[PDB]
Design an enzyme around this catalytic site. Structure first.
Site, PDB file in Angstrom:
ATOM      1  N   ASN A 167       6.212   8.649   8.660  1.00 37.55           N
ATOM      2  CA  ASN A 167       6.139   7.191   8.405  1.00 37.55           C
ATOM      3  C   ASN A 167       7.457   6.861   7.740  1.00 37.55           C
ATOM      4  O   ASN A 167       7.652   7.229   6.571  1.00 37.55           O
ATOM      5  CB  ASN A 167       5.011   6.772   7.482  1.00 37.55           C
TER       6      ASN A 167
ATOM      7  N   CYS B  20       4.973   0.175  12.434  1.00 39.23           N
ATOM      8  CA  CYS B  20       3.650  -0.320  12.815  1.00 39.23           C
ATOM      9  C   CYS B  20       2.942   0.545  13.858  1.00 39.23           C
ATOM     10  O   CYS B  20       2.692   1.730  13.618  1.00 39.23           O
ATOM     11  CB  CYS B  20       3.782  -1.758  13.314  1.00 39.23           C
TER      12      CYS B  20
ATOM     13  N   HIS C 161      -2.403  -0.854   8.349  1.00 42.97           N
ATOM     14  CA  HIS C 161      -2.178   0.557   8.566  1.00 42.97           C
ATOM     15  C   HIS C 161      -2.651   0.950   9.956  1.00 42.97           C
ATOM     16  O   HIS C 161      -3.769   0.610  10.346  1.00 42.97           O
ATOM     17  CB  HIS C 161      -2.893   1.394   7.520  1.00 42.97           C
TER      18      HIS C 161
ATOM     19  N   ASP D  22      -2.616  10.285  11.809  1.00 39.22           N
ATOM     20  CA  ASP D  22      -2.279   9.272  10.810  1.00 39.22           C
ATOM     21  C   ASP D  22      -0.878   9.578  10.292  1.00 39.22           C
ATOM     22  O   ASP D  22      -0.711  10.121   9.196  1.00 39.22           O
ATOM     23  CB  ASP D  22      -3.314   9.261   9.690  1.00 39.22           C
TER      24      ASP D  22
END
Lengths: 15, 333
Positions: free
Chosen positions: B8, B12, B253, B270
Protein backbone atom coordinates in the site's frame (compact mmCIF):
# COMPACT_ATOMS: atom_id res chain seq x y z
CA UNK A 1 -17.65 16.85 -11.27
CA UNK A 2 -17.18 16.95 -7.54
CA UNK A 3 -14.43 17.80 -5.09
CA UNK A 4 -12.75 14.50 -4.22
CA UNK A 5 -13.61 12.87 -1.92
CA UNK A 6 -13.02 9.13 -1.73
CA UNK A 7 -15.99 7.79 -3.73
CA UNK A 8 -14.79 7.05 -7.26
CA UNK A 9 -17.27 7.91 -10.12
CA UNK A 10 -16.36 8.00 -13.78
CA UNK A 11 -16.60 11.46 -15.21
CA UNK A 12 -18.38 9.79 -18.12
CA UNK A 13 -21.19 9.26 -15.61
CA UNK A 14 -21.13 12.87 -14.27
CA UNK A 15 -22.83 14.90 -17.05
CA UNK B 1 -1.95 -19.22 1.30
CA UNK B 2 1.15 -19.44 -0.98
CA UNK B 3 0.35 -16.02 -2.46
CA UNK B 4 2.00 -12.65 -1.99
CA UNK B 5 0.43 -9.23 -1.58
CA UNK B 6 0.92 -5.77 -3.01
CA UNK B 7 2.34 -2.82 -1.08
CA UNK B 8 0.00 0.00 0.00
CA UNK B 9 0.01 5.74 -2.40
CA UNK B 10 -3.68 6.53 -2.95
CA UNK B 11 -4.15 3.89 -5.64
CA UNK B 12 -7.52 2.71 -4.26
CA UNK B 13 -8.97 -0.20 -6.30
CA UNK B 14 -5.76 -0.88 -8.30
CA UNK B 15 -4.18 -3.58 -6.14
CA UNK B 16 -7.53 -5.39 -6.07
CA UNK B 17 -7.74 -5.34 -9.85
CA UNK B 18 -4.09 -6.30 -10.28
CA UNK B 19 -4.50 -9.47 -8.20
CA UNK B 20 -7.70 -10.22 -10.11
CA UNK B 21 -5.88 -10.11 -13.46
CA UNK B 22 -2.78 -11.94 -12.16
CA UNK B 23 -4.94 -14.96 -11.25
CA UNK B 24 -6.44 -14.94 -14.74
CA UNK B 25 -3.69 -17.42 -15.50
CA UNK B 26 -4.21 -17.51 -19.25
CA UNK B 27 -3.94 -13.72 -19.41
CA UNK B 28 -0.88 -13.72 -17.13
CA UNK B 29 0.89 -16.17 -19.43
CA UNK B 30 0.06 -14.16 -22.55
CA UNK B 31 1.38 -11.05 -20.84
CA UNK B 32 4.59 -12.96 -20.15
CA UNK B 33 4.73 -14.02 -23.83
CA UNK B 34 4.18 -10.53 -25.16
CA UNK B 35 7.49 -9.41 -26.69
CA UNK B 36 8.79 -6.30 -24.99
CA UNK B 37 12.15 -4.50 -24.93
CA UNK B 38 13.30 -1.92 -22.32
CA UNK B 39 15.90 -1.14 -19.60
CA UNK B 40 13.26 0.29 -17.19
CA UNK B 41 9.82 -1.28 -16.49
CA UNK B 42 8.28 2.16 -15.85
CA UNK B 43 8.86 2.90 -19.55
CA UNK B 44 5.66 1.18 -20.69
CA UNK B 45 2.58 -0.46 -19.27
CA UNK B 46 3.35 -3.84 -20.93
CA UNK B 47 6.83 -3.82 -19.35
CA UNK B 48 5.52 -2.71 -15.96
CA UNK B 49 2.70 -5.30 -15.95
CA UNK B 50 5.15 -8.04 -16.98
CA UNK B 51 7.27 -7.00 -13.99
CA UNK B 52 4.36 -6.85 -11.51
CA UNK B 53 3.11 -10.29 -12.54
CA UNK B 54 6.65 -11.72 -12.47
CA UNK B 55 7.11 -10.43 -8.89
CA UNK B 56 3.67 -11.63 -7.69
CA UNK B 57 4.63 -15.06 -8.94
CA UNK B 58 8.13 -15.12 -7.45
CA UNK B 59 8.51 -12.75 -4.49
CA UNK B 60 7.92 -13.76 -0.89
CA UNK B 61 7.63 -10.08 0.10
CA UNK B 62 4.90 -7.59 -0.89
CA UNK B 63 5.23 -6.39 -4.50
CA UNK B 64 5.64 -2.70 -5.35
CA UNK B 65 3.71 -0.88 -8.06
CA UNK B 66 5.54 2.47 -8.36
CA UNK B 67 6.76 1.77 -11.91
CA UNK B 68 3.38 0.52 -13.01
CA UNK B 69 1.59 3.68 -11.87
CA UNK B 70 4.41 5.76 -13.40
CA UNK B 71 3.90 3.91 -16.72
CA UNK B 72 0.20 4.72 -17.02
CA UNK B 73 0.23 8.09 -15.27
CA UNK B 74 -2.25 7.79 -12.38
CA UNK B 75 -0.19 9.15 -9.46
CA UNK B 76 -2.83 11.11 -7.48
CA UNK B 77 -5.99 10.23 -5.57
CA UNK B 78 -7.95 12.30 -8.08
CA UNK B 79 -6.90 10.21 -11.03
CA UNK B 80 -8.42 7.14 -9.42
CA UNK B 81 -11.50 9.00 -8.15
CA UNK B 82 -12.32 10.24 -11.71
CA UNK B 83 -12.64 6.67 -13.00
CA UNK B 84 -14.63 3.49 -12.54
CA UNK B 85 -12.66 0.30 -11.96
CA UNK B 86 -13.38 -1.02 -15.47
CA UNK B 87 -11.88 2.18 -16.95
CA UNK B 88 -8.53 1.27 -15.27
CA UNK B 89 -9.04 -2.39 -16.37
CA UNK B 90 -9.56 -1.14 -19.99
CA UNK B 91 -6.49 1.23 -19.76
CA UNK B 92 -4.24 -1.80 -18.90
CA UNK B 93 -6.06 -4.41 -21.10
CA UNK B 94 -6.41 -2.21 -24.27
CA UNK B 95 -2.71 -1.19 -24.18
CA UNK B 96 -1.64 -4.80 -23.70
CA UNK B 97 -4.09 -5.99 -26.38
CA UNK B 98 -2.64 -3.43 -28.85
CA UNK B 99 0.93 -4.47 -27.82
CA UNK B 100 0.01 -8.09 -28.82
CA UNK B 101 -1.09 -6.79 -32.29
CA UNK B 102 0.84 -8.97 -34.80
CA UNK B 103 2.59 -11.18 -32.19
CA UNK B 104 2.44 -14.88 -31.11
CA UNK B 105 -0.14 -14.00 -28.36
CA UNK B 106 -2.36 -11.85 -30.67
CA UNK B 107 -6.11 -11.96 -29.85
CA UNK B 108 -5.63 -13.36 -26.31
CA UNK B 109 -7.54 -10.49 -24.67
CA UNK B 110 -10.71 -10.69 -26.80
CA UNK B 111 -10.53 -14.53 -26.57
CA UNK B 112 -10.76 -14.28 -22.75
CA UNK B 113 -13.02 -11.27 -22.14
CA UNK B 114 -14.99 -10.26 -25.20
CA UNK B 115 -18.67 -11.05 -25.59
CA UNK B 116 -21.25 -10.06 -28.17
CA UNK B 117 -24.51 -8.18 -27.64
CA UNK B 118 -26.99 -6.44 -29.86
CA UNK B 119 -29.03 -3.37 -28.98
CA UNK B 120 -32.09 -2.23 -30.82
CA UNK B 121 -34.68 0.51 -30.91
CA UNK B 122 -37.91 -0.44 -32.65
CA UNK B 123 -40.53 2.18 -33.46
CA UNK B 124 -44.12 1.16 -32.72
CA UNK B 125 -45.93 3.24 -35.32
CA UNK B 126 -43.41 3.67 -38.14
CA UNK B 127 -41.06 1.36 -39.98
CA UNK B 128 -37.83 2.34 -38.33
CA UNK B 129 -35.45 0.16 -36.39
CA UNK B 130 -31.89 1.08 -35.34
CA UNK B 131 -30.48 -2.44 -34.68
CA UNK B 132 -26.83 -1.89 -33.57
CA UNK B 133 -24.54 -4.89 -32.81
CA UNK B 134 -21.63 -4.11 -30.41
CA UNK B 135 -18.89 -6.00 -28.48
CA UNK B 136 -18.13 -5.79 -24.71
CA UNK B 137 -15.31 -6.81 -22.30
CA UNK B 138 -17.24 -6.08 -19.05
CA UNK B 139 -20.79 -5.42 -17.97
CA UNK B 140 -21.98 -2.56 -15.74
CA UNK B 141 -24.85 -3.91 -13.63
CA UNK B 142 -27.45 -1.75 -11.95
CA UNK B 143 -27.97 -2.69 -8.28
CA UNK B 144 -30.42 0.13 -7.25
CA UNK B 145 -33.73 -1.59 -6.31
CA UNK B 146 -32.25 -5.01 -7.16
CA UNK B 147 -32.02 -7.59 -4.39
CA UNK B 148 -29.68 -9.95 -6.24
CA UNK B 149 -27.70 -10.31 -9.43
CA UNK B 150 -30.45 -12.17 -11.29
CA UNK B 151 -32.64 -9.08 -10.95
CA UNK B 152 -29.72 -6.99 -12.23
CA UNK B 153 -29.55 -9.13 -15.36
CA UNK B 154 -33.34 -9.07 -15.73
CA UNK B 155 -33.28 -5.27 -15.57
CA UNK B 156 -30.28 -5.22 -17.93
CA UNK B 157 -32.16 -7.01 -20.73
CA UNK B 158 -35.59 -5.52 -19.94
CA UNK B 159 -37.38 -3.72 -22.76
CA UNK B 160 -37.43 0.02 -22.13
CA UNK B 161 -40.45 2.00 -23.30
CA UNK B 162 -39.52 5.24 -25.06
CA UNK B 163 -42.79 7.10 -24.60
CA UNK B 164 -44.35 10.29 -23.18
CA UNK B 165 -41.34 12.66 -22.91
CA UNK B 166 -38.84 9.80 -23.64
CA UNK B 167 -40.38 9.45 -27.18
CA UNK B 168 -37.56 8.31 -29.48
CA UNK B 169 -36.14 10.95 -31.83
CA UNK B 170 -36.63 9.07 -35.08
CA UNK B 171 -35.22 11.86 -37.25
CA UNK B 172 -37.36 12.34 -40.37
CA UNK B 173 -40.20 10.53 -38.50
CA UNK B 174 -40.22 13.02 -35.67
CA UNK B 175 -40.69 11.90 -32.09
CA UNK B 176 -41.94 8.29 -32.04
CA UNK B 177 -42.98 5.77 -29.41
CA UNK B 178 -40.47 3.01 -29.52
CA UNK B 179 -39.04 0.05 -27.59
CA UNK B 180 -35.35 0.09 -26.49
CA UNK B 181 -33.49 -3.10 -25.40
CA UNK B 182 -30.31 -5.19 -25.61
CA UNK B 183 -29.79 -8.95 -26.12
CA UNK B 184 -26.77 -11.10 -25.22
CA UNK B 185 -25.52 -13.19 -28.11
CA UNK B 186 -22.50 -14.62 -26.26
CA UNK B 187 -20.89 -14.42 -22.83
CA UNK B 188 -17.07 -14.50 -22.58
CA UNK B 189 -14.96 -17.13 -20.79
CA UNK B 190 -14.05 -14.50 -18.15
CA UNK B 191 -16.93 -12.26 -17.10
CA UNK B 192 -16.23 -8.89 -15.42
CA UNK B 193 -19.33 -7.47 -13.74
CA UNK B 194 -19.20 -4.07 -12.10
CA UNK B 195 -21.86 -3.51 -9.47
CA UNK B 196 -22.75 0.16 -9.90
CA UNK B 197 -22.98 1.08 -6.19
CA UNK B 198 -21.03 4.37 -6.77
CA UNK B 199 -22.86 7.08 -8.77
CA UNK B 200 -23.08 10.89 -9.04
CA UNK B 201 -26.50 12.12 -7.79
CA UNK B 202 -27.50 15.27 -9.77
CA UNK B 203 -30.38 15.89 -7.28
CA UNK B 204 -28.00 16.38 -4.24
CA UNK B 205 -24.83 17.31 -6.28
CA UNK B 206 -22.73 14.60 -4.65
CA UNK B 207 -21.05 11.33 -5.45
CA UNK B 208 -22.87 8.73 -3.35
CA UNK B 209 -22.44 5.08 -2.45
CA UNK B 210 -25.36 2.72 -2.37
CA UNK B 211 -24.79 0.23 0.44
CA UNK B 212 -28.04 -1.73 0.05
CA UNK B 213 -27.95 -5.50 0.21
CA UNK B 214 -27.27 -7.23 -3.11
CA UNK B 215 -26.78 -10.99 -3.20
CA UNK B 216 -24.66 -12.93 -5.71
CA UNK B 217 -24.09 -16.68 -5.92
CA UNK B 218 -21.13 -19.00 -6.08
CA UNK B 219 -22.54 -20.42 -9.34
CA UNK B 220 -24.33 -18.07 -11.75
CA UNK B 221 -26.51 -19.64 -14.47
CA UNK B 222 -26.92 -17.16 -17.30
CA UNK B 223 -28.55 -19.31 -20.02
CA UNK B 224 -31.81 -17.46 -19.44
CA UNK B 225 -30.25 -14.19 -20.67
CA UNK B 226 -28.89 -15.48 -23.98
CA UNK B 227 -30.82 -14.97 -27.24
CA UNK B 228 -29.96 -18.62 -28.11
CA UNK B 229 -28.39 -21.09 -25.66
CA UNK B 230 -25.87 -23.81 -26.61
CA UNK B 231 -26.99 -27.26 -25.39
CA UNK B 232 -23.29 -28.35 -25.31
CA UNK B 233 -22.10 -25.42 -23.11
CA UNK B 234 -24.63 -24.16 -20.57
CA UNK B 235 -23.70 -20.63 -19.49
CA UNK B 236 -23.00 -21.60 -15.86
CA UNK B 237 -20.39 -19.25 -14.38
CA UNK B 238 -18.19 -19.91 -11.34
CA UNK B 239 -17.41 -17.03 -8.98
CA UNK B 240 -13.70 -16.21 -9.04
CA UNK B 241 -13.16 -12.79 -7.44
CA UNK B 242 -15.11 -10.44 -5.18
CA UNK B 243 -13.72 -6.90 -5.21
CA UNK B 244 -14.80 -5.17 -2.03
CA UNK B 245 -14.95 -1.60 -0.78
CA UNK B 246 -15.40 -0.33 2.75
CA UNK B 247 -16.06 3.27 3.68
CA UNK B 248 -17.56 6.56 2.51
CA UNK B 249 -16.57 9.81 0.83
CA UNK B 250 -14.00 10.61 3.55
CA UNK B 251 -11.92 7.50 3.26
CA UNK B 252 -12.21 3.93 2.21
CA UNK B 253 -10.41 0.66 2.08
CA UNK B 254 -10.19 -1.79 -0.84
CA UNK B 255 -9.65 -5.56 -0.63
CA UNK B 256 -10.15 -8.48 -3.00
CA UNK B 257 -11.19 -12.01 -2.02
CA UNK B 258 -10.00 -14.56 -4.61
CA UNK B 259 -10.20 -18.36 -5.06
CA UNK B 260 -7.23 -18.56 -7.53
CA UNK B 261 -7.84 -22.14 -8.62
CA UNK B 262 -11.62 -21.89 -8.91
CA UNK B 263 -11.96 -24.74 -6.38
CA UNK B 264 -13.55 -22.80 -3.46
CA UNK B 265 -10.35 -22.31 -1.38
CA UNK B 266 -10.76 -18.53 -0.82
CA UNK B 267 -7.96 -16.12 0.21
CA UNK B 268 -8.43 -12.42 1.17
CA UNK B 269 -5.86 -10.07 -0.47
CA UNK B 270 -5.54 -6.90 1.65
CA UNK B 271 -2.53 -5.13 0.14
CA UNK B 272 0.46 -6.77 1.84
CA UNK B 273 -1.63 -9.19 3.96
CA UNK B 274 -2.83 -12.30 2.14
CA UNK B 275 -4.73 -14.84 4.27
CA UNK B 276 -6.93 -17.89 3.78
CA UNK B 277 -10.51 -17.08 4.60
CA UNK B 278 -13.95 -18.75 4.59
CA UNK B 279 -16.35 -18.84 1.64
CA UNK B 280 -18.76 -16.83 3.80
CA UNK B 281 -16.19 -14.02 4.29
CA UNK B 282 -15.73 -13.87 0.52
CA UNK B 283 -19.38 -14.07 -0.51
CA UNK B 284 -22.33 -13.48 1.87
CA UNK B 285 -20.38 -11.13 4.15
CA UNK B 286 -19.96 -8.79 1.15
CA UNK B 287 -23.65 -8.64 0.32
CA UNK B 288 -24.10 -5.33 2.23
CA UNK B 289 -27.40 -4.15 3.67
CA UNK B 290 -20.69 0.10 4.51
CA UNK B 291 -18.50 -2.89 3.36
CA UNK B 292 -19.70 -4.72 0.18
CA UNK B 293 -18.68 -5.85 -3.32
CA UNK B 294 -18.51 -3.43 -6.22
CA UNK B 295 -17.13 -5.84 -8.84
CA UNK B 296 -17.27 -9.61 -9.46
CA UNK B 297 -15.33 -11.90 -11.76
CA UNK B 298 -16.93 -15.15 -12.93
CA UNK B 299 -15.42 -17.81 -15.17
CA UNK B 300 -17.40 -20.19 -17.43
CA UNK B 301 -17.44 -23.70 -15.82
CA UNK B 302 -16.41 -25.21 -19.23
CA UNK B 303 -13.42 -22.82 -19.71
CA UNK B 304 -12.25 -22.94 -16.02
CA UNK B 305 -9.38 -25.39 -16.59
CA UNK B 306 -8.05 -23.51 -19.63
CA UNK B 307 -8.40 -20.03 -18.10
CA UNK B 308 -6.82 -21.20 -14.83
CA UNK B 309 -4.17 -23.47 -16.39
CA UNK B 310 -1.02 -23.65 -14.30
CA UNK B 311 1.59 -21.03 -15.15
CA UNK B 312 5.04 -22.38 -14.32
CA UNK B 313 8.50 -20.89 -14.52
CA UNK B 314 8.68 -22.56 -17.93
CA UNK B 315 5.88 -20.34 -19.30
CA UNK B 316 7.98 -17.16 -18.87
CA UNK B 317 10.26 -16.42 -21.85
CA UNK B 318 14.04 -16.38 -21.12
CA UNK B 319 14.34 -12.93 -22.79
CA UNK B 320 11.87 -11.48 -20.19
CA UNK B 321 13.48 -13.31 -17.23
CA UNK B 322 16.79 -11.89 -18.34
CA UNK B 323 15.40 -8.38 -18.76
CA UNK B 324 13.83 -8.45 -15.29
CA UNK B 325 16.92 -9.97 -13.64
CA UNK B 326 19.19 -7.24 -15.14
CA UNK B 327 16.76 -4.55 -13.97
CA UNK B 328 16.79 -6.11 -10.47
CA UNK B 329 20.63 -6.09 -10.44
CA UNK B 330 20.74 -2.33 -11.41
CA UNK B 331 18.09 -1.66 -8.69
CA UNK B 332 20.18 -3.52 -6.07
CA UNK B 333 23.52 -1.61 -6.12
Amino acid sequence: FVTXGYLXVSXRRCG
Amino acid sequence: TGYVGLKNGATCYMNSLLQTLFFTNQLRKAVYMMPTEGDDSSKSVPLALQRVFYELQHSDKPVGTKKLTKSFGWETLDSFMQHDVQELCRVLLDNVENKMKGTCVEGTIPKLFRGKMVSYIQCKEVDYRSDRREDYYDIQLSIKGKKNIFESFVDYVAVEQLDGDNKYDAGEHGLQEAEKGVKFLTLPPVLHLQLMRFMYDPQTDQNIKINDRFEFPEQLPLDEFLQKTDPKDPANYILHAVLVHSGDNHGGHYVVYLNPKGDGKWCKFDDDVVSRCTKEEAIEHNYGGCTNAYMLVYIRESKLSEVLQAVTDHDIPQQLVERLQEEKRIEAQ
